[PDB]
Amino acid sequence: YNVFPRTLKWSKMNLTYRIVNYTPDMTHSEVEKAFKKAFKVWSDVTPLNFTRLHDGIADIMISFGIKEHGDFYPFDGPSGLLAHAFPPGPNYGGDAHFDDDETWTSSSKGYNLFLVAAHEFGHSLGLDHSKDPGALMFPIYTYTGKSHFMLPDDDVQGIQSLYGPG
């Protein structure tokens, strides 16, 4: 596993998040459910707790966009970049952005929101890319219809080395 320079991390176990907008590719419940599961794979092996906010500024603001969406990291249409998140910190820290130019789904079609978001939140939590082809933090996409997706060994060690067990 790999940590960001200066070992960026949150200084609190209770984080909040908010879904700013949704993709038309799937139902709103699906989207909501995908993100909830994405966070759980991380909170399941650490003391980290996540709670969704209906309004206001949360630690982790989630959103979909195309091309230029407001930051200095614009998307590139279909394929290529799928999403990008900011490491822990104030403002953009922890924020996760999804390319709505891709087709998001909750199945083996297009790009699985749940899997990609689980990877993204790993960045929002303080994990950089892993060089282990068997880790969730590996920089290449792959689908998994596996029931009850568990966090790979490498990712577990990397997240616990930051917030301890849980």
Which residues form the catalytic set? Answer: 120
Residue from 4, 39, 50 nearest 151 by CA: 39
Interacting partner of 97 out of Zn ion, ligand FA4, Ca ion, none (Cβ under 5 to 8 A depending on kind): Zn ion
Residue span binding Ca ion (CB under 5 A) among the ranges 19-27, 40-48, 140-148, 153-161: 19-27
3-class SS at 41?
Answer: helix
Answer yes or no whether residue 82 interacts with ligand FA4 by CB under 6 A: yes
Contacts (CB under 6 A) with ligand FA4, residues 103-122:
115-116, 119-120
CA distance 165 to 74: 36
Structure-block tokens of residue 17: 């998040």
CB of 32 to Zn ion, least distance (A): 6
39 vs 119, beta carbon nearer ligand FA4? 119
Burial (CB count within 10 angstroms: exposed 0-12, middle 13-18, buried 19+), residue 158 = buried
Residue with tokens 């038309």: 24
List residues binding ligand FA4 (CB under 6 A): 81-84, 115-116, 119-120, 133, 135-136, 138-142, 144
**Binding-site ranges for Zn ion (CB under 5 A):** 71, 73, 97
